[PDB]
Amino acid sequence: TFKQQKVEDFYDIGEELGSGQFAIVKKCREKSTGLEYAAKFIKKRQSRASRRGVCREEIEREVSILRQVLHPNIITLHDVYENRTDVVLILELVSGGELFDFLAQKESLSEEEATSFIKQILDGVNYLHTKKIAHFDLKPENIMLLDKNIPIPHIKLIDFGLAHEIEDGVEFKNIFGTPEFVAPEIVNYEPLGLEADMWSIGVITYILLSGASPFLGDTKQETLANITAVSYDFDEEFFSQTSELAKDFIRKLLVKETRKRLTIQEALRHPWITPVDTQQAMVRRESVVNLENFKKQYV
Amino acid sequence: TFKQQKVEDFYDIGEELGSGQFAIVKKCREKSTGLEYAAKFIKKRQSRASRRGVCREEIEREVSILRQVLHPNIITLHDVYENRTDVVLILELVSGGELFDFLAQKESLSEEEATSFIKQILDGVNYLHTKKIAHFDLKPENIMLLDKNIPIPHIKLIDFGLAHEIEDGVEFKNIFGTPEFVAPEIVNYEPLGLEADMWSIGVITYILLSGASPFLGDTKQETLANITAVSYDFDEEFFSQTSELAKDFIRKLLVKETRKRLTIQEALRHPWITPVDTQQAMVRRESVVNLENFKKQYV
Ligand SMILES: Nc1ncnc2c1ncn2[C@@H]1O[C@H](COP(=O)(O)O)[C@@H](O)[C@H]1O
Numbered sequence: 379t380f381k382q383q384k385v386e387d388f389y390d391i392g393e394e395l396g397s398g399q400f401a402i403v404k405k406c407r408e409k410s411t412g413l414e415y416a417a418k419f420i421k422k423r424q425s426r427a428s429r430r431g432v433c434r435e436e437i438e439r440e441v442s443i444l445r446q447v448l449h450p451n452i453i454t455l456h457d458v459y460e461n462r463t464d465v466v467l468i469l470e471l472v473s474g475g476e477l478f479d480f481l482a483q484k485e486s487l488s489e490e491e492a493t494s495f496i497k498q499i500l501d502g503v504n505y506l507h508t509k510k511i512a513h514f515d516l517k518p519e520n521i522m523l524l525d526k527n528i529p530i531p532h533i534k535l536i537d538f539g540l541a542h543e544i545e546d547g548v549e550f551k552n553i554f555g556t557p558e559f560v561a562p563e564i565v566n567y568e569p570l571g572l573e574a575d576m577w578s579i580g581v582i583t584y585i586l587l588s589g590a591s592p593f594l595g596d597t598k599q600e601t602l603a604n605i606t607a608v609s610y611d612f613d614e615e616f617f618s619q620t621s622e623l624a625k626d627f628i629r630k631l632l633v634k635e636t637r638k639r640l641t642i643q644e645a646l647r648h649p650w651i652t653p654v655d656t657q658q659a660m661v662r663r664e665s666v667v668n669l670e671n672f673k674k675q676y677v
Numbered sequence: 678t679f680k681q682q683k684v685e686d687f688y689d690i691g692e693e694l695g696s697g698q699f700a701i702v703k704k705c706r707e708k709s710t711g712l713e714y715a716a717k718f719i720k721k722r723q724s725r726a727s728r729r730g731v732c733r734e735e736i737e738r739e740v741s742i743l744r745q746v747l748h749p750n751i752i753t754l755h756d757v758y759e760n761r762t763d764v765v766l767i768l769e770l771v772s773g774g775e776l777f778d779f780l781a782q783k784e785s786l787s788e789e790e791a792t793s794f795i796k797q798i799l800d801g802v803n804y805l806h807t808k809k810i811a812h813f814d815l816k817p818e819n820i821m822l823l824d825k826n827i828p829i830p831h832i833k834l835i836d837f838g839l840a841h842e843i844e845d846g847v848e849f850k851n852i853f854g855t856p857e858f859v860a861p862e863i864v865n866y867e868p869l870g871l872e873a874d875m876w877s878i879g880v881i882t883y884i885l886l887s888g889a890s891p892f893l894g895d896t897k898q899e900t901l902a903n904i905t906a907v908s909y910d911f912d913e914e915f916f917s918q919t920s921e922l923a924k925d926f927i928r929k930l931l932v933k934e935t936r937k938r939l940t941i942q943e944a945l946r947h948p949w950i951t952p953v954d955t956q957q958a959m960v961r962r963e964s965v966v967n968l969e970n971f972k973k974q975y976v
Pocket residue numbers: 395396397398399401403416418453469470471472473519520536537
């Protein structure tokens with residue numbers, strides 16, 4: 379249940395850190411402990427027909443999920459307050475910005491370094507999937523870093539606004555997500571599960587390695603058609619330096635049939651992520667990433 | 678071609694009329710004639726990946742369709758300007774706000790009066806469909822009034838951002854529109870055509886008469902489920918004064934099978950809209966819109 383108290387009685391509310399549809403995030407400091415957090419103010423929907431704000435039931439669902447998750451690569455919920463207009467999530471403060479913005483200012487990136495970031499994502503997703511929680515909004519802007527000024531920045535997955543607990547024998551279908559990153563079952567309005575997350579990881583990896591996006595077309599119409607046709611390529615212009623193992627990883631994630639798509643456990647065990655011998659570890663270490671196109675696309 | 682000139686050089690730009698995704702619409706007056714228009718400032722997309730702006734092709738499509746339409750119940754296009762950030766559509770000014778807001782201030786409303794407004798909409802849609810143009814965004818906010826201060830205001834359909842010319846043999850699929858008003862073929866990502874407009878008219882009619890919404894659930898997920906199941910009723914709480922003629926009209930529009938749904942021509946010739954005898958005309962005259970519920974829902 380949400381605390382029916384004024385958050386500003388308990389926290390000093392500071393500068394705005396970011397925003398999204400429905401939400402404004404401000405830095406804050408809890409008065410009694412002096413510890414800092416991010417306060418995410420979520421505007422409640424006031425009527426069923428309104429397209430503004432979030433339905434309080436859906437906010438409750440996000441909170442229910444967040445309260446269950448404690449893992450180094452997943453944002454940690456601290457508290458929840460409510461007033462007339464907003465539900466306020468007090469979240470672990472993540473100060474390192476978005477992963478992509480960090481990689482975009484980067485000078486040099488090998489596939490070994492790339493997989494270390496991807497593996498952090500896989501660890502977080504694995505933890506969620508074990509608890510039968512689908513994130514359903516895996517995309518660059520929801521992959522943040524605790525501190526961008528350390529040798530190996532530490533990934534935190536945020537934004538559980540679309541997250542859902544998948545129940546066996548209960549069908550879940552909905553239309554949501556950013557076209558560039560949604561799986562074919564989302565576009566086709568077919569039953570949804572943990573597999574959509576794995577497709578998204580395939581897309582994020584593809585972009586991370588090449589700067590290009592596998593299904594993105596001139597228009598949303600084209601993007602959606604491309605996704606449902608699973609029409610993509612590894613254009614040599616952008617993938618000339620990419621290892622076959624990296625491509626194999628992506629190929630096994632960008633698969634229409636949900637049953638055949640890699641599961642999170644299989645992804646974690648794929649040789650690209652977890653080499654089984656020195657020979658593979660070298661190939662990965664020597665494969666250099668395409669920061670030219672990536673920067674063009676994300677700067 | 679868009680005029681590569683500063684719209685401000687030729688128009689005095691006045692107060693805001695409304696806004697949308699990457700569009701802001703303002704009153705304006707052309708200096709050379711003193712005539713008033715609405716200027717729709719569409720923000721152009723900068724990269725194929727942004728969730729911001731509108732790409733060249735889609736702006737062009739909207740202009741191309743607007744150029745073709747000249748009908749009393751559809752806004753007319755006057756001119757098009759372009760600068761570095763925006764394409765500006767100079768459109769016929771519609772000053773009387775939205776139809777529903779006008780009906781919501783009404784004391785009393787019979788089905789006869791109601792059908793005369795609905796017939797204005799049908800006339801506009803009939804004109805588009807004859808040119809094989811689907812509007813694809815028929816909903817209350819896009820049904821406006823030229824002048825809300827005359828006894829029986831004239832309807833103008835606006836917002837052709839989703840409009841599309843339907844080509845024989847060429848499949849068109851896309852994901853768009855407001856959940857409450859989209860047809861099952863939109864939700865299911867199946868081939869689209871002129872029929873989607875007809876479903877929307879069914880929903881608009883249902884709400885106009887009763888104040889209730891046929892498929893609206895507590896959440897978007899529910900709404901979409903209701904739509905694809907065509908799960909709706911004529912709850913006597915709201916429809917106890919509505920004619921069987923009106924309900925028949927709605928039943929024939931809210932049909933999943935696109936080939937079975939009324940066409941615009943058939944809707945214009947449905948006896949609720951165009952009675953074939955004196956008796957039907959009386960029934961319509963003796964049936965009443967549920968203004969009580971309508972007002973409740975539209976405030
Ligand atoms: N826990 C957090 N710590 C710091 N900044 C955040 C946090 N959550 C969200 N933000 C900021 O708010 C933006 C929108 O967050 P969201 O709507 O959850 O994706 C992010 O892109 C960040 O800039």
